[PDB]
Design a protein around this ligand. Sequence first.
Ligand SMILES: [Zn+2]
Ligand SMILES: [Zn+2]
Lengths: 147, 148, 74
Amino acid sequence: PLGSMQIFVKTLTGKTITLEVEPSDTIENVKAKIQDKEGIPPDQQRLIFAGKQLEDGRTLSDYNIQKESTLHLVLRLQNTIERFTFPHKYKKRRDTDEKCTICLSMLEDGEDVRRLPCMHLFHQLCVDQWLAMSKKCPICRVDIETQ
Amino acid sequence: SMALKRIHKELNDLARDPPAQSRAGPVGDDMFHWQATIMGPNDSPYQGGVFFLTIHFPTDYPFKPPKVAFTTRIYHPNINSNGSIKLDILRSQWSPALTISKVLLSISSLLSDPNPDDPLVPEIARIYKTDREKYNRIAREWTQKYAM
Amino acid sequence: IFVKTLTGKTITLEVEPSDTIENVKAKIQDKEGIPPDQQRLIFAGKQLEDGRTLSDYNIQKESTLHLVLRLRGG
Ligand SMILES: [Zn+2]
Ligand SMILES: [Zn+2]
């Protein structure tokens, strides 16, 4: 949206999203800007800067964010899977077509879906079986117990 | 039930998108038993040669790795005379995000990048780790007498 | 240049012949979410090491690189 300047966010895998923002941008607007670039709802995102997690209803300058500042992106919050992972049902945007690397079928609206702290996406049934024997991510080899 | 569907989907993508210098497919009506061809790495002594491989899909696929073995005889520190390939991604570094075409291309990458320090056939390792010049000659003769 | 990723989606990359392989892996990290520790690049069956540049392999425009997880011959 051609913000007054730019900032970066880093996921657990080290992937870096560049955002255009103005110091007068609310944090819920920053989450949505990330939604338009990777497809993560603000519902799922949790942002961390300078040791504190950013609450929905404040501004970037309240947390005193600079130019070239870096945010950190983690997930908001057999049964240990549900303790480290975010389940939801997929919602298709509109390359923005995603597929489950385990069953190799594309992802559809209404399908029960899983997202790991590395910010990767799979079907719920497919990755729940794989995590029952490895606890790591099939795409980037990141443990779901990573914090 | 749970595994055959991926083998079906991998196969369709293999037909529409034939991999880079690698062909594979099932034998007869046995969807868990495939054959495969592999081309030579470009700089390695196996360059230009074609290598045949047997692959067996376990029932737990893709949650467990596929069993892959050479049938053409190849001279390599990590590949014995029985065609066995000890390769971490085929054992414990296995990921269900690896399709056969990407598993096969991983194997060709192993030919161009041997590892003598953790070997399978140590006799081949010592020859490599003392005079690669003589190793490359022998490996080139093996890939020319069996794979050309 | 092009890259066949683990999701099968061939993705375009804008690099010049002076770029090292570690540069290319980093660009893939930003568009894929896979650290350069776990990235193995392959062109014409051969692996590409982090030290040399794209021109050292004489990789020219519109070439297609492939991406697999990091291996370890054992
Ligand atoms: Zn799936
Ligand atoms: Zn991941």
